[PDB]
Amino acid sequence: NEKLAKKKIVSIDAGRKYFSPEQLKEIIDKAKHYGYTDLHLLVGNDGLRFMLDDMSITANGKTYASDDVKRAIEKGTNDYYNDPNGNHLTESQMTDLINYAKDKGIGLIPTVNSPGHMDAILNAMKELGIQNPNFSYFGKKSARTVDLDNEQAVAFTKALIDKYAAYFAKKTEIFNIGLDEYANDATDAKGWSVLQADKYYPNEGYPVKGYEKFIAYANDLARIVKSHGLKPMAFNDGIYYNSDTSFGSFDKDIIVSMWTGGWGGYDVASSKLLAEKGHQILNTNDAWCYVLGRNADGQGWYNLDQGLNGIKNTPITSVPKTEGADIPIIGGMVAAWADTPSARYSPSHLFKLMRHFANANAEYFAADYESAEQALNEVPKDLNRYTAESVAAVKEAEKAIRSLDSNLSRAQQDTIDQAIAKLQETVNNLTLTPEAQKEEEAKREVEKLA
Ligand SMILES: CC(=O)N[C@@H]1[C@@H](O)[C@H](O)[C@@H](CO)O[C@H]1O
């Protein structure tokens, strides 16, 4: 009940890798069937694979024509990965997809990642004449991250997010700004420490007020998302990294997708700290997580068997790095990633992961009422042909279906299935009146004269 009110989300990496509208509709059908509430669609994540009809941008006193932005982005994406299946979703396809999901009671949550995982936008910005948009660390240039000290590149990124946010306004509820790295490829995976370093180790060439600037950046993206009536979300990585609250405060309306509890040399804030600060927590435990193409034990980290085992061993309420506290959650999210985007997407592998997550946490997931609705529509129309006793039993069985609690969980699916089987039995039991019997035999007789 309070369990049923939680979000249950599947995440799909359609930033690195192309997914067709047909493929996503199939994912949505499964999400509805298994009792999920939302599809989390990354469209900006290395690649940028969603294109508005109007891509014109004004940023920091400069104007960029819609057609030039489209060309620049399309090519920037292909420079990351030129996917044989496609390049991007169009605005018509996205609007249709969102409507499709909405008719099935399923929400859509887009991600456009920054300041990291934004290769395609960085490439596009170069083509559009913005100089040095990428962060560089003592001569090593990030392929994925924007330099927060480059005002023009920051202004362009923000203007692009604002344009996506304008489109998603009213059609969606939540917008994921990501915030999940800062130049890990250029700093030996220590981007957050690099941003914090100059405060504790001055005059050594570390980015001046780096982490302070990241906070302002996060907060301004949150302001932008909210100005469009949407809720901002981000991954947990950089939010009070090293539990350091001394650089400033993150906007507490930022919903945190808590995917990692960190590891040796990667010291993220505990979910305990984030919850105490007042951030809502979406449990996105990487115990559940799955990388396309890594389909069985032995094929590397986050293979499908590993994800399945994680789902068995880590319930939806089990959040990374709790430090022993009871962490309240708004929901849970299982994630499929496309780290090697040329890997073949296998729908059946994904659905297995989704089904197991639903089954392991059945009291949280919605029951499936679709077969019940179908059973009702399939009751014969011509009931006057049948015995009063047999018709009354059918009517009773229909009523029992219509009076089922509309808020059953997946754990209570049997209740619905028994009502369906009972209706079918009563329909099977429909018995012709003597008058209908005579008419039917008269009709078989003429039909034989053919
Ligand atoms: C911030 C971060 O590194 N997120 C990573 C994502 O980019 C990657 O696709 C996935 C599987 O390897 O692990 C995620 O959580």
Side-chain angles (χ1 to χ4, degrees), residues 373-446:
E373 282 150 16
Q374 187 166 342
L376 290 174
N377 300 329
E378 279 173 13
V379 174
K381 292 282 154 50
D382 51 343
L383 301 180
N384 289 327
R385 301 165 76 214
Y386 304 108
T387 262
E389 176 164 295
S390 88
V391 169
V394 168
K395 248 62 171 144
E396 199 186 353
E398 279 178 330
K399 182 175 176 201
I401 287 174
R402 295 205 177 92
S403 73
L404 285 161
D405 181 343
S406 58
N407 250 266
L408 293 169
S409 79
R410 183 177 182 79
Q412 302 166 298
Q413 185 65 39
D414 281 8
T415 297
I416 293 159
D417 293 355
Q418 290 180 55
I420 292 168
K422 178 65 170 165
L423 175 65
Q424 182 67 70
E425 171 192 308
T426 64
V427 165
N428 290 352
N429 290 350
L430 284 164
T431 298
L432 290 173
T433 66
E435 299 66 44
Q437 182 79 39
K438 199 198 176 200
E439 287 176 73
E440 168 77 30
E441 289 167 33
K443 196 199 307 288
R444 287 173 203 164
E445 184 73 359
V446 311

Side-chain angles (χ1 to χ4, degrees), residues 29 32-33 104 367-375 377 413 416 420:
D29 290 341
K32 168 64 165 196
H33 186 56
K104 291 190 170 283
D368 174 32
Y369 295 80
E370 195 156 330
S371 278
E373 282 150 16
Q374 187 166 342
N377 300 329
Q413 185 65 39
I416 293 159
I420 292 168

Side-chain angles (χ1 to χ4, degrees), residues 13 16 45-46 113 117 180-181 184 235 237 259-260 263 266 286 289-291 294 301-302 337-339:
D13 186 8
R16 295 190 174 93
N45 190 48
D46 294 313
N113 224 330
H117 294 106
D180 66 9
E181 72 166 340
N184 282 336
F235 298 106
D237 308 71
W259 78 273
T260 185
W263 58 82
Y266 194 63
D286 73 339
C289 125
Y290 164 53
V291 174
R294 308 193 190 153
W301 206 252
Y302 300 138
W337 300 98
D339 294 39

Side-chain angles (χ1 to χ4, degrees), residues 44 50 68 71 77 102 134 146 152-153 202 211-212 217 246 273 294 297 317 425:
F50 171 43
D68 296 322
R71 264 183 297 278
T77 290
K102 168 188 194 276
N134 305 50
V146 70
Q152 183 69 28
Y211 193 71
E212 188 180 328
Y217 180 79
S246 73
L273 177 61
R294 308 193 190 153
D297 173 48
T317 52
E425 171 192 308

Side-chain angles (χ1 to χ4, degrees), residues 40 176 233-237 254-260 280-284 333:
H40 182 266
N176 192 338
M233 168 169 94
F235 298 106
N236 66 283
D237 308 71
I254 294 170
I255 297 164
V256 182
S257 173
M258 190 89 204
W259 78 273
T260 185
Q280 296 185 296
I281 305 295
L282 172 67
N283 189 9
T284 309
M333 170 163 93

Side-chain angles (χ1 to χ4, degrees), residues 154-446:
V154 171
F156 189 93
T157 303
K158 295 186 180 177
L160 191 57
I161 300 301
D162 183 74
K163 270 202 106 93
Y164 284 105
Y167 168 83
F168 284 118
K170 320 262 202 143
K171 301 183 180 68
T172 56
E173 181 197 342
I174 296 158
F175 186 108
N176 192 338
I177 54 181
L179 309 177
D180 66 9
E181 72 166 340
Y182 196 84
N184 282 336
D185 62 327
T187 59
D188 298 317
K190 294 153 189 176
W192 306 120
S193 286
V194 167
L195 289 178
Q196 291 180 342
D198 184 77
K199 168 156 177 174
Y200 302 104
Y201 304 91
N203 331 285
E204 267 147 282
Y206 296 123
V208 175
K209 288 174 148 80
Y211 193 71
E212 188 180 328
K213 273 162 178 154
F214 172 70
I215 294 173
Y217 180 79
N219 286 349
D220 196 38
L221 294 186
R223 179 200 60 79
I224 285 162
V225 168
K226 290 188 274 180
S227 75
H228 293 286
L230 295 169
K231 295 168 156 56
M233 168 169 94
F235 298 106
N236 66 283
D237 308 71
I239 315 294
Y240 303 115
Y241 183 85
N242 201 38
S243 311
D244 199 329
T245 58
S246 73
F247 292 84
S249 293
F250 286 88
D251 182 332
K252 72 197 208 174
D253 292 332
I254 294 170
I255 297 164
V256 182
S257 173
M258 190 89 204
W259 78 273
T260 185
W263 58 82
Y266 194 63
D267 304 287
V268 300
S270 63
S271 45
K272 178 178 193 283
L273 177 61
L274 299 186
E276 293 163 352
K277 300 306 269 191
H279 297 269
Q280 296 185 296
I281 305 295
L282 172 67
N283 189 9
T284 309
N285 204 305
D286 73 339
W288 314 324
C289 125
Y290 164 53
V291 174
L292 264 48
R294 308 193 190 153
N295 280 342
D297 173 48
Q299 289 164 33
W301 206 252
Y302 300 138
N303 69 73
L304 180 66
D305 288 325
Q306 184 178 354
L308 296 167
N309 191 52
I311 281 160
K312 189 185 72 185
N313 293 327
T314 312
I316 197 169
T317 52
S318 179
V319 184
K321 202 174 177 168
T322 61
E323 296 191 340
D326 186 353
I327 306 302
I329 58 159
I330 62 161
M333 170 163 93
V334 56
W337 300 98
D339 294 39
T340 297
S342 62
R344 186 193 149 255
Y345 162 55
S346 161
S348 70
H349 286 77
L350 172 64
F351 301 151
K352 189 176 182 195
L353 187 79
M354 284 166 75
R355 174 175 61 81
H356 275 242
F357 188 54
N359 283 345
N361 299 284
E363 313 201 338
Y364 289 82
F365 284 72
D368 174 32
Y369 295 80
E370 195 156 330
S371 278
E373 282 150 16
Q374 187 166 342
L376 290 174
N377 300 329
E378 279 173 13
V379 174
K381 292 282 154 50
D382 51 343
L383 301 180
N384 289 327
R385 301 165 76 214
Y386 304 108
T387 262
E389 176 164 295
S390 88
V391 169
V394 168
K395 248 62 171 144
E396 199 186 353
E398 279 178 330
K399 182 175 176 201
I401 287 174
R402 295 205 177 92
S403 73
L404 285 161
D405 181 343
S406 58
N407 250 266
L408 293 169
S409 79
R410 183 177 182 79
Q412 302 166 298
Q413 185 65 39
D414 281 8
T415 297
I416 293 159
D417 293 355
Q418 290 180 55
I420 292 168
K422 178 65 170 165
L423 175 65
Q424 182 67 70
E425 171 192 308
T426 64
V427 165
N428 290 352
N429 290 350
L430 284 164
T431 298
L432 290 173
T433 66
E435 299 66 44
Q437 182 79 39
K438 199 198 176 200
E439 287 176 73
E440 168 77 30
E441 289 167 33
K443 196 199 307 288
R444 287 173 203 164
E445 184 73 359
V446 311

